[PDB]
Amino acid sequence: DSDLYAELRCLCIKTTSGIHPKNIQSLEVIGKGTHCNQVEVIATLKDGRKICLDPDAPRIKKIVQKKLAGD
Amino acid sequence: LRCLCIKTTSGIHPKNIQSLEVIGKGTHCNQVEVIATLKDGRKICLDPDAPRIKKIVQKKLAGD
Amino acid sequence: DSDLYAELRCLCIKTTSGIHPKNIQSLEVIGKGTHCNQVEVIATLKDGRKICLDPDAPRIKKIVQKKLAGD
Amino acid sequence: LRCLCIKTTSGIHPKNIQSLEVIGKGTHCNQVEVIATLKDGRKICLDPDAPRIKKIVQKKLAGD
After folding, report:
1. List the disulfide bonds (chains A, C).
2. Which residues form the domain of A54?
3. How many domains does chain B have?
4. CA closest to B14 among chain A residues
5. What is the CATH number for B51?
6. Which residues of A are less than 8 Å from C49 in CB distance?
7. C26 touching B, CB under 8 A?
8. Which of A13, C4, C29, C55 gives the lowest tally of CB atoms within 10 Å of its CB?
């Protein structure tokens, strides 16, 4: 809890569960660790923009399973 | 440009996974690709259709 | 400026060139794009902590070249 | 988990690369791995020893 100079920790303090899966190009799930003590999910949109998703949101868990499935 | 993951696995323990990237099918890759990054920086492809993997993903998402 | 709700843009507003190459596990170089109009370099330390490196610093460019080479 | 890049390439245009990740040799992968993510989300392995790749990396760092 004593940051190193220029250290990058958690990326997403604000999150949403309101995205349409058809607009997502890829998804990254970053588990808890020494860099940040909360799970963070980042969705990369087809246009390159990125958005912070709520890992605990039921809708987000279902979006992740459909993606895995090729849905 | 094409598929990166030609060999995949389904028996990795979740304690070792730091993060996962899920990429859908595209013009030059007709399969969903799941790349896990280990705590030691090494990377591996996971079988997206194996039930063991679907559960490891849900646990990673929940803080497991 | 119009950001989408919960959008993630630039990650490193503070950067440094004072890092020892031997402590770096992996390096990520993220080019400019719609998500952020400046190059960003994130070094992941052996312990998992992450730090923002200066891409324009001669010392950083040389650290990337020795890493590519297996140093 | 071990070496992810068995096939690498040295002829991709930097215009297509969004980001690169460089991973050093470890206990079970005796080669530096360079994974490029294209703007379409596909991933590819780059030959770290080729001069055309060493230069593409420097252009990326420089913002070209």
Report:
1. 10-36, 12-52
2. 1-71
3. 1
4. A31
5. 2.40.50.40
6. 4, 7, 34-35
7. yes
8. A13
